[PDB]
Amino acid sequence: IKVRENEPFDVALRRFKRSCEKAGVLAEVRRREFYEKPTTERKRAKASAVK
Amino acid sequence: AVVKCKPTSPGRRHVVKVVNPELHKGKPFAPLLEKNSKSGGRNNNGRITTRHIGGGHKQAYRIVDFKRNKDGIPAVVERLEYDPNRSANIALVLYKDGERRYILAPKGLKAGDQIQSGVDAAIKPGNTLPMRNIPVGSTVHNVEMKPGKGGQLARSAGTYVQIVARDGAYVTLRLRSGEMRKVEADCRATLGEVGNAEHMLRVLGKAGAARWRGVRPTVRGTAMNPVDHPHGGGEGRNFGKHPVTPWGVQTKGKKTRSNKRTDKFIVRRRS
């Protein structure tokens, strides 16, 4: 979660949060408890991941 | 165990009893009994001061130990008994030095059960000890309000008081009312909750049951003439007035606490 750097620093370059929290994990927990749509969203996500 | 009576003869149709097989079927312990003469609701002037009281069954008073002074001596619960003067049951207990006393019976307490009053008592239900030694957030009954005086809070059946704070020489207590009250922390209190909760589930069923607990009828105010009650009179049913006591003071809302002496000790009124 943290970053620090010594005096050679210019830019933020914190892409630790395109790794874990920001993009998916908080936008997922904005909306409803189903049990049902996730079983089919994961079903078609794993059925789309195919060659 | 609550039991609906079978509806033979109306009068029994709606009765719910609270039977207890663990109460002592027999005579109470005699040298802790004394005469309790019934008053009728009437003061030393003869006048009815509290209305609706009178008749009912003959009762003998049972000296219940609310103080719990025998500190450090253990006591085994000899039995549980029916007390007519209270909602709760009383446990007759036997100290190790051969002294019997009646205490209010807490919730889990059966016959053959060790209780122990005093500072170094174990924290388990039935043990009376000062509230600077009880943990915060514990259900506690038979609470003293002044140290040494006797228990006066949470005595009626199924009733507890939660200790919520220990700020200094005082403990903040959530009374069963919902009221937050400060009590001095040297005041003893008995652990657990007092134990006949199902008392509130009984339904009495007929008019004579109320009569035999000593509760005379209540004539309602609007059925009277104007000379009797402020509600009075009127050619069929006629209310038209703001509801009052029989002495003209507003019922239905009007707050009647005036103390100013114990307002220091009230952290929050009930709601």
Binding site: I1, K2, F16, C20 | -
Partner: protein, 55 residues
Amino acid sequence: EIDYKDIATLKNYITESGKIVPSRITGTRAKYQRQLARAIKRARYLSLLPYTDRH
């Protein structure tokens, strides 16, 4: 993997913010990913590892 007290091994199999890493990344055949995760959780109870990096 079988053990949870070896927190060097467990600390390899965890991310920088306390989260268990998927077997899609680290190899780790599924039996040992299950033993692994269950050992990580037993270690987080004992405060050998952290639950997160914002305690």
